[PDB]
Write a protein that binds this ligand. Structure first.
Ligand SMILES: Cc1ncc(COP(=O)(O)O)c(/C=N/[C@@H](C)C(=O)O)c1O
Ligand SMILES: *Cc1c(COP(=O)(O)O)cnc(C)c1O
Lengths: 345, 339
């Protein structure tokens, strides 16, 4: 396995002049969750994108966007980020010998992502505004500067991210009934749908129902209005004006899917559920896909017996502070005695 | 699944459950820029992509699968580090309880469902009581003395051979308790005798403040920023020594400054982020290339044992890249961007 550009070049806008950039991204596990599957009465798998080199699915788009930006002659890339896009941008820039400038919302990106941006060598600019404010600035600057924009409005980002749908079909042996996915800036749900349509066209696989889930306090698509003050403890998807809004809606309509919302309480519960029941640790915003499966299994929007693939978009180590916060452990102190300890259990 | 992939090398029976979190098969990444600068062909085995973020997962999936096979219903260890996280995730995946005993970060382990119990002793007291409990109950001990952890961990050497297409000249690897260097060596020997691959020189690296094997003396209070390898009395000490001996290798030491320098270097130059303890393998490669013990033109695999996200505090603390705080205003941001 030598990275996405090599593996899927047949589906990518790459030429012999594209730099052979890779951090061995892609090819992530599709993990069957038999306990949750039996509890829910469905066949549930998780695409664990936390295994990608910078710990999220953003690596898929970033390797494409950075390579094309280099192929186009740039020495500098820029993005706004809730943390995972900036971490991917900074790593691939470092790998590609390019400068990386990132604009992040002060106090609103997970601590692991800040460590990454710092430990990849990005020029980090923190603003008092939110992600939506940062993206507006970054797009404005890149219109007027010799700096390549690598946010998801760069179409090369979606070309890389659609490979995830290719893998899901290859790993499941068929397309799933449901692709459940978190929605922040909405590029990823759009990319998966493009991937499923291209695979349907080339290989005959069926078309999943695209089921996206915003966080309630940032569910701009669900509310059908721009959210000027989005909030959620799942700061990855704390995004109130998704730049791929229309593409996401088109993906739900064309796939007979839906973009739904889940509450923060529901997110945190799914967050603990997969770690406790299956040994799978994903960051809170990723667990919106699992909260969404729980919500729609109950309502019947996901019927029993469905083959469901939920995307866990980011590693749980991205956000140590949420895990520390909700896992209040005040361990009992016991005498050093076999009977004391065994009896307490 | 690692157990499935390598069952011919593993104590797998028809009764072994198919336990997996899809650990293993981790990337082996060529570092072309560092390679050019050093005059070697340098690859890194990036074990931080394992499920809990450490190579430990290799050994824990094997130990827990065997524990479940025997009919235990609980896993127990005394630890606070990556061991506790790995044991707890595989316990949860195996549908088993997990108990961690600590002397008076654990959040990941607790997320996986580990029950934390503190005792009024030191870590030695904790390991002693864990062993006594496990000897008398259906609670399996998964501290480092559990042999199945070495068996699991040896698969990393099989992967390196299959990923390179040959054994490397040099396997550079951190040494904490020294389980890992012995697992890799055992794996190379088995792969050599079965498939004809060559035998690498095993090059282990301790942090100088915790370098018990290098100093040939138990270090009572070991020190280093690299918490993963702050082990003052390596449990697999002699096994590691014989591994370096059988393989014409060496166990060496690196300073914290060297570790931190490698830490920052692989991240800035190659986009590869590993936890500080892991970067001892890179610091040692730098040190032994400069000393000629790694000759120019060697094919070298350095093992990056853990995810850099394991330790965000060191990353921020030691870096001089500090985020600059700017008004939400394009003009002031453009002017800084040229500034
Ligand atoms: C972990 C995680 N999950 C889901 C999403 C949302 O995916 P989307 O709908 O935007 O394609 C993000 C987005 N992170 C971006 C916005 C960032 O890091 O800047 C994310 O980091
Ligand atoms: C456990 C660990 C080590 C030490 O490996 P040993 O087998 O004890 O020599 C090094 N780095 C990380 C990240 C670890 O988890």
């Amino acid at each position: 396995w030598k990275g996405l550009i090599h593996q899927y070049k047949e589906f990518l806008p790459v030429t012999d002049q594209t730099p052979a950039l890779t951090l061995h991204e892609g090819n992530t596990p599709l993990i069957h969750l038999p306990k949750l599957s039996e509890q829910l009465g469905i066949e549930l798998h998780v695409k664990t994108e936390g295994v990608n080199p910078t710990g999220s699915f953003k690596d898929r788009g970033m390797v494409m966007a950075v390579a094309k930006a280099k192929e186009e002659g740039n020495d500098t890339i820029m993005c706004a980020s809730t943390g995972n896009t900036s971490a991917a941008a900074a790593a691939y820039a470092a790998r590609a010998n390019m400068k990386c400038i990132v604009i992040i919302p002060n106090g609103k990106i997970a601590f692991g992502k800040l460590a990454q941006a710092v430990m990849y060598g990005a020029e980090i600019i923190a603003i008092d505004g939110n992600f939506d404010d940062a993206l507006k600035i970054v797009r404005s600057i890149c219109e007027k500067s010799p700096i390549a924009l690598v946010n998801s409005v760069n179409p090369y980002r979606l070309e890389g991210q659609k490979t995830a749908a290719f893998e899901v079909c290859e790993q499941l042996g068929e397309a799933p009934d449901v692709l459940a996915i978190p929605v922040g800036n909405a590029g990823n749900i759009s990319a998966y749908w493009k991937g499923f349509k291209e695979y349907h066209e080339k290989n005959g696989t069926s078309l999943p129902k695209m089921r996206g889930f915003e966080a309630e306090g940032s569910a701009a698509i669900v509310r059908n209005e721009v959210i000027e003050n989005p909030e959620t403890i799942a700061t990855a998807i704390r995004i109130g004006n998704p730049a791929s809004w229309d593409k996401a809606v088109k993906a739900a309509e064309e796939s007979n899917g839906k973009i739904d919302e889940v509450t923060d309480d529901e997110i945190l519960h799914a967050y603990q559920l997969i770690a406790r029941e299956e040994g799978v640790f994903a960051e809170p915003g990723s667990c919106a896909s699992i909260a969404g499966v729980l919500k729609q299994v109950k309502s019947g929007e996901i019927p029993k017996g469905s083959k469901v693939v939920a995307v866990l978009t980011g590693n749980g180590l991205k956000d140590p502070n949420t895990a520390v916060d909700i896992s209040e452990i005040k361990p009992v102190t016991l005498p050093t005695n076999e009977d004391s300890i065994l009896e307490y259990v």
